[PDB]
Each structure stands twice: as structure tokens, then as C-alpha cells.
Design a protein around this ligand. Structure first.
Ligand SMILES: Cc1cn([C@H]2C[C@H](O)[C@@H](COP(=O)(O)OP(=O)(O)OP(=O)(O)O)O2)c(=O)[nH]c1=O
Ligand SMILES: [Ca+2]
Ligand SMILES: [Ca+2]
Ligand SMILES: [Ca+2]
Ligand SMILES: [Ca+2]
Ligand SMILES: [Ca+2]
Length: 900
DNA sequence: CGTCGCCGCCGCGCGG
DNA sequence: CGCGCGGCGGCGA
């Protein structure tokens, strides 16, 4: 096979590399790598190395990496550019793997672990590590086994061995309901003392050294606790055995609030799953406990136990160990679904970076670009110092707040990357500048043509048309990958809707799910078989369809994020190719493109309908437009349609056959105007929205910029079995809004758009009556706990203290002097509740860590003093009044003459 | 060390 | 609750 690296590190003058050899075996080597850097030379000397501007360079080969680094410093002291890859391990990887990397995931050791630490005196601080580690479950991807290390004797209690038999039994049998599919995969090892446990762990770690190290909060907890506990018991050199090269560093993350010291293990790539999940999942959650994320992702119940966790080992060691094992598997199950590890490996190997660098698009793009340029013997520029400067972004149209019955949206495919490709925006393609007219002049096509030679953006920039820049070239490759995966995703989604439809008539039989590839549209043959299947098989197929969809979503949306990050990186000072001329060229062009097509769509539809000056485009944001279709529907007449799907077909056909061709012509004209290198402004129909035929639903409404709701029947070619609410910006979409409130506000909107004013009034009235029965968690707001110490004055709110910080301070006073109460962690999420006047907490609100029940100490008092009225007024009624007034509806029935 | 736009809540200090 | 301004949180692109 083709060799591929596992991990790479620079230690002084040595590259330490772990890799898979041609035989598929893990090896390690130390290389005294001689790096090269470059300096400009006279045009009058022979060379094959040139910078991106075509200036000739001479290669400087160094005896070792430290010499190379010192040369950089001397070049700074002289005042001359030191060119080339100054991250010597990226140069090493480029030299060693001078080909597209084919990796075999089965050869890569992915370790998933978690630890248990019994602690009576509060949260066990990793940097102190003063309490015994009493359980480690370490899953190994290569062995496919859960290795369980269990402490039997501790200063906090001596316990019996864990029973695998009881762990397999149902909870109703007194068991732990450890899923049957992993029972045979548990290798259980009890220990009489913590020393032997840790020594055996390290020996085990030596035999099965993780390449990818993951788990839940392992970077902030498990890793530093294990390292520090071992350091406390045995000394540093023994702790350093967690690194295959025996080197570690104790380092902080730079922020703007506080600091936390994490452990860098040289020769391992740590990908904490919480960090994988936060970057790649495209959610914001009220809580990031594994219980919460597991319930959300997998619909599994919370791990249930009595008393505090600090007493669990003592009271019920059986369950303690089982819940440790189950916690590991749940991360595996989340990954099986989301596929973030797979995504990380893909991106990592593509860029030829340390895998853990996927968290950093700047590092990723820096390495992609460097490899692309090196292939052509081109030399990258030195990174420079730049002051942070604000620059303009997208255009957003101000909508007229109103109901909107029929709506068709259109959206530009991958806007910013396509602008980069169309215009040819790249560091080395800058051709010069032209004299800019006000942007509206370009929008209305009244400004003089920018250039007859070069490709232009209305910010004044000009670019070469003779050849593609490295940015367009490299961004196009990832874009194409993205497109493929989006194709798989949408097809899985369409297939899902076919299964949903079929589920309306399940056939009563014993049968199996069809063996199909969900990434491809179901054939007619498959459709007919599905029409003959039982609910059991259809539901299992739907589950499989939805899993394929999720897999496709992960692959596509994060490649989208990566290509969009290239456009953003051009506006970040740490990017090697930082250039505000290029970042602004993208965004200004975007503002022109949007407003230009607004004009064209308006001009086109006015002609179709025989009017003048009327606005059809009601809204737009960045690259999408929302077109009112009322008049199109009205021109045929609502009476003429058989059912909802019929007018949906009609709008789909009208958008695909009349509007899209007009949109294309309008954009082809803009391309010529700007003299761009390649027409790539592709604006397709996205949504078809409206109320059900014959109903009193309003279809959609806008309250303002980035705030609207639509009743969608068709989204980029996916015809839904049941209409789906597209809601943006409104309170239903915010992680800060109470759960039950999100739910009720969503149902109010559903009723408004699908059913009408009377249905909405019927629901509101019922919610208002029953609201006081809602569980306190379901009605708590959520916020992030930032800068607590800034607003802490003696335990009481300082000047300008935010509401939620006030709540935290109230909580702190209430729990003061209590070792075992959950402390609020700076930066993490809190639930927030209003408190009625004259409560014992001595303030108007209280906040506690999210995802958890509030400590039993103050729960009863919180539940008794919760201010439901404030809750109902602030989180529900005020948002609802905002919706309804915008939609010109009343949520409460107004009095009429009929009341006699 | 991808970006900007822009919403609503809140504290504050008004606003004769 | 009448109002904007700045801080904040949190999405929407
Ligand atoms: C989502 C997102 C968009 N944008 C900008 C760049 C996008 O091109 C532009 C439009 O956003 P989107 O329409 O959400 O995304 P897109 O056009 O790039 O991709 P798609 O084909 O799925 O429509 O807004 C960002 O800068 N960062 C982001 O995270
Ligand atoms: Ca635990
Ligand atoms: Ca788009
Ligand atoms: Ca599209
Ligand atoms: Ca059937
Ligand atoms: Ca869009």
C-alpha cells in the first residue's frame, strides 16, 4: 500500500514521525530533517524557484531546523523577507508524501476513553489531582474492545468486583442495561490498588498507543487528570510515558476571560469530541453534558442514579463501572452517526497537516496552498504583521413587516467561493485598481465599465484573466468534493420522503428492509417494493435513509465551512495571504450581485404581469432573494388548482422554466459588465412556500431583517410528505429560549401559517391556562456564563451587571461555603429563572449550571419562588405579540358586534 | 487566529 | 413602559 503518516512532531532538530509503512504496519522514526527556506535573488542567476509573483528565489538548505529558525531571525534584523514554509513539520510532510494521500482508517488507532474520580470535597481539579483515579474505560478501535480498569480499594471505599452478568441485565432486573452488542467486547481488569492500576494502564498505553485520542472533555479533564495523578504518584518521567516520544508541555489557550492549562502530548493527536461536536455539528446547545448530547443525538435516556456522584462508587459500584463503560460507547455511537472522526481524517490528510489542526481553517488552508505551490516549484511568502481592520460584509434588505402568502426563494450556489472563482481573486492575480463609482451605479448598470482587460470587483480591484490563481484553483477542488456529498445528502432526503409517504399505508406482513444505497434516488423498482413493505421494515429503512442523510450533511456542510473560511481568512491578520483588498473584493461583489438580481427579477416579473415599479422581491440576505408569488398564483386563479401539490408543481415549473432562465441572463450580463474570468453566479430556486389550499393559513411572515417564518412544501427539489416550517431568527430558533417556550411558539407559528387566526387564538388561550404546570427546566432561559468576576462585587451585582450574571451571583451566595454544590464554570451555560419579589435568595433571578437539576439544597425554594408571570410575559407573550402584529393577526379574539 | 450583519434583552440614564 | 446607546449573546448569512 501507499504509506501514510499518523502523527508528526518537531523536537529540537528532530522530526519524530509515527507512520504506516508499505506493509500496513505502525512504525516510528526520528529524522534529522534538513529544511529549506528561500531568499529573493537577482533576475540574472539560474533558478527553478520563484515566488508567487514570478520573482526568482534561491534555495537555502540548512544543516538543521534550529539553523533555519535563526536564519529567519537574522533576516528580520537585516530587513529582508524569509520565504518558504517556516512550519518545518508541514515541509517534512510535503517532502515525505509527495502524492495524494490514500489512508486506511482500519490501520489508525483511535482511542476513546473516560475516567472516574471519587471526590468528597468538590470538583476534582486536574491540576491538583489529589484524589485516586478509580475507573478507566479505554476503547481501542483496532482491537474493537472496551478495556475497563477498575479500582477495588481506595481511601474512599473498598468495593466488590464489577459483574458483567448484572451489567447485561435489564434495569427492571436490577441490571445496568449495558447494550448487548458490546458485552462480548469488554475486557475487565480489577485492581487491588491505584498504583498497580496506573502502572498497568501505562504499560497497556505503551502497547496500544493512541494515534487519535478522543472522548468527552478529555482535553480539559481526563487527559490532564491522568497526567497529573501519575505525576503526583510516580514523578514527571512516568507521566510523560503518555507521549510516545516522552515529551509533553503544560500550556494555556489564549482568550479574553481567564486561562486553563492543558497537556500537549507530543506524538498524539487529541481530538476532544466536545470540540469536534462544537465545530462540526452546526448546533448550539443549552447544555454540553454527555447525557444531554446523547439524548439529543441518539434519543437514549439519561443515565439514572441516586445520590451525588461523589457517593455513587460507595453506594453502587456496579452501576458506577457500568455507567463509565456506557459513557465511552455513547461517544462511539454519536460518532457512528455524525462521522466527525472520519471528516477530521479526510481533511487532515488532504491538507497534509497534523490531524488536530482541522480545528484551524487558517492552518488547513496554509498547508493546502503551500503543497499546491510547491508542486510547481513556487515559494510561499513570509507571514507578515498586520493591524486588525474592520471591513464591509453582505447586504441585507429591510423587509416590510407583513404576512406573505405565496413565496418562492432563490439562492446562489456557494456564493463566496464562486465569487473567488468567477472574479479570479487570489494574492498573485492582483492586476491593479480602477476608479470606483458608488455601488448603486453598478447595481443599476449606469457606471462606466471597470476594465476591458482584467476581471473586476466593484470595490475597485482588478485581476488577471490569463490564468487561475492558486486560491481559485484550490478552493474549486474542495468545492467539487462538497458538491458530490451534497448530492448524496439531498438524494437520501428525497428517498426519506418516499418512505414517509409509504408509511401512510404499511402492508401487514413479516419482511426485511431493502438492501439499497440511500445516496442515490430510488429506482421505480425499489419504489414499488417499498409500497409493499411493513411498518417495521419501512421505519428501519427510514432510520437508514436519515443516517445516510446525516453522514452526507456532515461531509458537505463542513467542506462548505472550509471553503467559506478561505474567504474569511483573507480578512484575518494571522493568515499568510491576509489582504483586505481581496476580502472586500469578495463581499462588495456579493452586495452587487444580490441587488443586481433583485433589480432584474423585479424588472422581469413586472413585464410578465404588465405592471411598473412594483416590488416582487420582498427580502434578501447576502445571496438569496425571496419573491412574492401571489400574483403568479392569482393569474391562473386559486379555484383552478386540484390540491396544494398542484400549485406547488405550478410554481416549481414556473421557477424552473421562466424565472431561472431570466436570472441566468441577468447574471451573465453582470459577468460581462465586470469582465469576469468565468460566469459562475448560479441562482436556483430553493423554497416554495404557502398555506395549504382551502385553508385560512397565512403561509409566511417577516418581522424584520433575519426574522421570518415560511410554510415550505418543497426545498431544493425535496418534495415533503408533510409541510415543513422554515423559521429563521425567531425565538423558536434560539438556544436561549426555554424549551417549552420554543415548542409553544413553534406551534403558534405552525397554526398561523397553516391554519389561521382562530386556530392561533385557540392554542394561545390553552397555553396560558396550562403554562404553570410546565417543569422548571422546560421553562428556564439559557445563557453563557461570561466574565462573572468582572461583575462580582463582594458577592453582589456590580454596575451594569447582566441579568444572567446577577442570577449566577445569587446562586453563588445561596451555595456559599458548600463544598459539594455544582459551581458555575466561567464560560459554560446556565439555566436562568426569574424570582418573585420577597424571595429568600434576596434578588430577582437565579442561575445554575445547565443540563443539570439544581442542587437539592435550594431546589424546593426555587420551585416555590419561580416567577411564572414574568416567565410567561418575557419569553412567550412578548415574542408572540411581535409575530402576530407583524402578521396583522390578533392572538386574543377582539370584541365584535356578534357578541349579542 | 475564517468573516460581517444585525436581531432582542438588559442596564442605564434619561425624557421637562 | 416611554426612548436610544453600549454590552452582550446568539444567530443568519
Ligand atoms: C453559512 C456561512 C455563509 N457565509 C457567507 C458566504 C456564503 O457564500 C454566503 C451565503 O451563505 P449560504 O447560502 O448559507 O451558503 P453558500 O451559498 O456558500 O452555500 P450553499 O450552496 O449551500 O447555498 O454567506 C459565511 O461567510 N460564513 C458562513 O458560515
Ligand atoms: Ca463520570
Ligand atoms: Ca447560497
Ligand atoms: Ca441550491
Ligand atoms: Ca403499502
Ligand atoms: Ca442563502
Amino acid at each position: 500500500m501507499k504509506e501514510f503518516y499518523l502523527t508528526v512532531e518537531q523536537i529540537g532538530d528532530s522530526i519524530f514521525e509515527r507512520y504506516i509503512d508499505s506493509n500496513g504496519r505502525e512504525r516510528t522514526r526520528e529524522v534529522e530533517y534538513k529544511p529549506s527556506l528561500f531568499a529573493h535573488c537577482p533576475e540574472s542567476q539560474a533558478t527553478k524557484y520563484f515566488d508567487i509573483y514570478g520573482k526568482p528565489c534561491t534555495r537555502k538548505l540548512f544543516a538543521n531546523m534550529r539553523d533555519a529558525s535563526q536564519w529567519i531571525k537574522r533576516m528580520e534584523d537585516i530587513g529582508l523577507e524569509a520565504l518558504g514554509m517556516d512550519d518545518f513539520k508541514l515541509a517534512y510532510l510535503s517532502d515525505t508524501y509527495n502524492y495524494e494521500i490514500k489512508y486506511d482508517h482500519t490501520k489508525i488507532r483511535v482511542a476513546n476513553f473516560d475516567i472516574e474520580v471519587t471526590s468528597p470535597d468538590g470538583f476534582p481539579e486536574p491540576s491538583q489531582a489529589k484524589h485516586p483515579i478509580d475507573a478507566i474505560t479505554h476503547y481501542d478501535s483496532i482491537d474493537d474492545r472496551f478495556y475497563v480498569f477498575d479500582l477495588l480499594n481506595s481511601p474512599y471505599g473498598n468495593v466488590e468486583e464489577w459483574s458483567i452478568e448484572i451489567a447485561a441485565k435489564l434495569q427492571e432486573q436490577g441490571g445496568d442495561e449495558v447494550p448487548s452488542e458490546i458485552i462480548d467486547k469488554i475486557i475487565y481488569m480489577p485492581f487491588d490498588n491505584e498504583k498497580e492500576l496506573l502502572m498497568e494502564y501505562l504499560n497497556f498505553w505503551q502497547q496500544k498507543t493512541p494515534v487519535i485520542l478522543t472522548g468527552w472533555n478529555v482535553e480539559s479533564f481526563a487527559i490532564p487528570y491522568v497526567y497529573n495523578r501519575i505525576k503526583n504518584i510516580f514523578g514527571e518521567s512516568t507521566a510523560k510515558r503518555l507521549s510516545p516520544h516522552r515529551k509533553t508541555r503544560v500550556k494555556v489557550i489564549e482568550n479574553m476571560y481567564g486561562s486553563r492549562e492543558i497537556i500537549t502530548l507530543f506524538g498524539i493527536s487529541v481530538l476532544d469530541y466536545i470540540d469536534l461536536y462544537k465545530k462540526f455539528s452546526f448546533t448550539n446547545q443549552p447544555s454540553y453534558s454527555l447525557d444531554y448530547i446523547s439524548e439529543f443525538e441518539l434519543n437514549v435516556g439519561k443515565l439514572k442514579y441516586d445520590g451525588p456522584i461523589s457517593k455513587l462508587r460507595e453506594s453502587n459500584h456496579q452501576r458506577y463501572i457500568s455507567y463509565n463503560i456506557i459513557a465511552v460507547y455513547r461517544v462511539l455511537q454519536i460518532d457512528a452517526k455524525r462521522q466527525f472522526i472520519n471528516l477530521s481524517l479526510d481533511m487532515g490528510y488532504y491538507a497534509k497537516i497534523q490531524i488536530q489542526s482541522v480545528f484551524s481553517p487558517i492552518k488547513t488552508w496554509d498547508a493546502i496552498i503551500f503543497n499546491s505551490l510547491k508542486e510547481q516549484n513556487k515559494v510561499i511568502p513570509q507571514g507578515r504583521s498586520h493591524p486588525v481592520q474592520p471591513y464591509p460584509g453582505a447586504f441585507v434588505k429591510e423587509p416590510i413587516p407583513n404576512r406573505y402568502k405565496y413565496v418562492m426563494s432563490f439562492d446562489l450556489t456557494s456564493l463566496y467561493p464562486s465569487i473567488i472563482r468567477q472574479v479570479n481573486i487570489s494574492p498573485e492575480t492582483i492586476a491593479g485598481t480602477f476608479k470606483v463609482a458608488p455601488l448603486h451605479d453598478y447595481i443599476n448598470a449606469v457606471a462606466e465599465r471597470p476594465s476591458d482587460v482584467y476581471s473586476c470587483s466593484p470595490n475597485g480591484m482588478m485581476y488577471y484573466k490569463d490564468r487561475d490563481g492558486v486560491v481559485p484553483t484550490e478552493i474549486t477542488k474542495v468545492f467539487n468534493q462538497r458538491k458530490e456529498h451534497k448530492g448524496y445528502m439531498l438524494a437520501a432526503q428525497r428517498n426519506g420522503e418516499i418512505i414517509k409517504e409509504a408509511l401512510h399505508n404499511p402492508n401487514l406482513s413479516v419482511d426485511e428492509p431493502l438492501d439499497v444505497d440511500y445516496r442515490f434516488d430510488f429506482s421505480d423498482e425499489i419504489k414499488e417494493k417499498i409500497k409493499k413493505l411493513s411498518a417495521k421494515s419501512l421505519n428501519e429503512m427510514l432510520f437508514r435513509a436519515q443516517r445516510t442523510e446525516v453522514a452526507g450533511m456532515t461531509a458537505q456542510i463542513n467542506r462548505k465551512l472550509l471553503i467559506n473560511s478561505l474567504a474569511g481568512a483573507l480578512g484575518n491578520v494571522w493568515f499568510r495571504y491576509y489582504d483586505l483588498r481581496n476580502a472586500t473584493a469578495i463581499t462588495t461583489f456579493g452586495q452587487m450581485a444580490l441587488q443586481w438580481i433583485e433589480r432584474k427579477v423585479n424588472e422581469y416579473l413586472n413585464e410578465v404581469c404588465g405592471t411598473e415599479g412594483e416590488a416582487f422581491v420582498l427580502y434578501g440576505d447576502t445571496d438569496s432573494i425571496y419573491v412574492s408569488a401571489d400574483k403568479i398564483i392569482d393569474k391562473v386563479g386559486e379555484s383552478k388548482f386540484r390540491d396544494t401539490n398542484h400549485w406547488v408543481d405550478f410554481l416549481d415549473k414556473f421557477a424552473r422554466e421562466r424565472m431561472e432562465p431570466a436570472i441566468d441572463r441577468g447574471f451573465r450580463e453582470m459577468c460581462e459588465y465586470m469582465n469576469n474570468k468565468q460566469h459562475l453566479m448560479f441562482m436556483d430556486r430553493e423554497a416554495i412556500a404557502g398555506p395549504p389550499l382551502g385553508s385560512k393559513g397565512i403561509g409566511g411572515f417577516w418581522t424584520g431583517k433575519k426574522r421570518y417564518a415560511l410554510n415550505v412544501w418543497d426545498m431544493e427539489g425535496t418534495r415533503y410528505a408533510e409541510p415543513k416550517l422554515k423559521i429563521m431568527g425567531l425565538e423558536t430558533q434560539k438556544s436561549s429560549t426555554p424549551k417549552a417556550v420554543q415548542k409553544a411558539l413553534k406551534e403558534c407559528i405552525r397554526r398561523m401559517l397553516q391554519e389561521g387566526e382562530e386556530s392561533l387564538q385557540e392554542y394561545f388561550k390553552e397555553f396560558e391556562k396550562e403554562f404553570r404546570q410546565l417543569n422548571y427546566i422546560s421553562i428556564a432561559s439559557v445563557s453563557s456564563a461570561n466574565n462573572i468576576a468582572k461583575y462580582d462585587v463582594g458577592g453582589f451585582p456590580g454596575p451594569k451587571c447582566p441579568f444572567h450574571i446577577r442570577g449566577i451571583l445569587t446562586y453563588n451566595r445561596a451555595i456559599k461555603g458548600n463544598i459539594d454544590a455544582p459551581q458555575v464554570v466561567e464560560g459554560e451555560k446556565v439555566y436562568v429563572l426569574p424570582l418573585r419579589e420577597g424571595n429568600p435568595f434576596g434578588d430577582k433571578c437565579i442561575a445554575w449550571p445547565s443540563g443539570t437539576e439544581i442542587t437539592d439544597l435550594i431546589k424546593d425554594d426555587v420551585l416555590h419562588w419561580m416567577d411564572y408571570t414574568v416567565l410567561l410575559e418575557k419569553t412567550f407573550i412578548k415574542p408572540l405579540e411581535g409575530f402576530t402584529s407583524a402578521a396583522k393577526l390578533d392572538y386574543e379574539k377582539k370584541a365584535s358586534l356578534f357578541d349579542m
